[PDB]
Amino acid sequence: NEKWFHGKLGAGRDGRHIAERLLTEYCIETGAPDGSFLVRESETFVGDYTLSFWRNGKVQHCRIHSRQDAGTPKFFLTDNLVFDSLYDLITHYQQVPLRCNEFEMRLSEPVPQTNAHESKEWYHASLTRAQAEHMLMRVPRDGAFLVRKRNEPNSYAISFRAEGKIKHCRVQQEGQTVMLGNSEFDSLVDLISYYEKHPLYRKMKLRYPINEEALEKIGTAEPDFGAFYVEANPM
């Protein structure tokens, strides 16, 4: 995939340190190899990206240059070898060593993001159980859900409608992975992509992402019906 592509990381020029914290937290916890990497917007060279990678418990940074030849983006670590995209650039350097400083090294494991859920239509950062129930009540359908942040640290909640009743599943951010009960996923984004395909609680799958727009394009101006922490289906 493009797991490795992190784009603009955090507060403007705090991206070098964020790139290091992310690579450090990942490489130490998972036990990833030297060569583990990710790409992001440059914090010094406008429009250029930066290749941050792990090597000997340190995190080294490389500049990815971005130029236009015939109004066509071209990317490169060195002008003797230019690519039509960052995928090509990355995939090349995964196979043949890149030279940074005065050491030669190939790229290895793509380091993903833990927070790609923050840009999803079903994710609500500030949302009370009662607030999400009120929203979930407004929707008549089943398999219509929303994930929200809980007050207790490194925790989220899947609030959903199942068999005409509103139940709640707990998820925990265990460092670089998430844990719904004894089951494990890379992230929420991947967890919900699984529970979109497979049932999460009983016969119900995660089909309809509810936000403010979804209440307009579906929901009822009237909450009250019938409507504890529920246990999901294993694995």
Residue numbers in the entry: 547 to 773, 782 to 789
What's written in the study?
To analyze the structural and functional implications of Y783 phosphorylation and the potential for intramolecular binding to cSH2, we obtained the crystal structure of a construct incorporating nSH2-cSH2Y771F,Y775F (545–790) following phosphorylation on Y783. The structure of the tandem protein revealed an intramolecular interaction between the cSH2 canonical pY-peptide binding site and residues 781GFpYVEANPM790. Residues 774 to 780 are not visible in the electron density map suggesting that this part of the linker remains disordered. The structure shows that the cSH2 domain makes an essentially canonical binding interaction with the extended linker in which the pY783 side chain makes multiple interactions with three arginine (R675, 694, and 696) side chains in the conserved pY-binding pocket. The side chains of residues pY+1 (V784) and pY+3 (A786) are directed into shallower, hydrophobic pockets (formed by cSH2 residues F706, L726, L746, and Y747). The side chains of V784, A786, and P788 all make van der Waals contacts with the cSH2 domain, burying ∼620 Å2 of solvent accessible surface. Although the structure of the cSH2 domain is not affected upon pY783 binding, a further, more detailed comparison of the crystal structure of the phosphorylated nSH2-cSH2 protein with the nonphospho (apo) construct in the same crystal form shows general similarity with some subtle differences in angle and distance between the domains (not shown). However, the second binding phase is highly suppressed due to occupancy in cis of the canonical pY-binding site on the cSH2 by the pY783-linker region. The cSH2, in contrast, makes contacts with the PLC-core and recognizes an intramolecular pY motif rather than a receptor site. It also seems that a relatively small change in the tandem cSH2-nSH2—induced upon pY783 binding to cSH2—is allosterically relayed to the nSH2 domain reducing the affinity for FGFR1 but with no corresponding allosteric effect on PLC activity.
Among families of proteins involved in signal transduction, phospholipase C (PLC) enzymes that generate second messengers from phosphatidylinositol 4,5-bisphosphate (PIP2) incorporate a number of different protein modules. PLCγ enzymes (PLCγ1 and PLCγ2), for example, contain eight domains, four of which are unique to this PLC family (Bunney and Katan, 2011; Suh et al., 2008). The PLCγ ‘specific array’ of domains (γSA), comprising a “split” PH (spPH) domain flanking two tandem SH2 domains and an SH3 domain, is inserted between the two halves (X and Y) of the TIM-barrel catalytic domain (Bunney and Katan, 2011). We demonstrate that among four domains present in the γSA, the cSH2 domain and its C-terminal linker provide a focus for most interdomain interactions both within the γSA and between the γSA and the PLC-core.
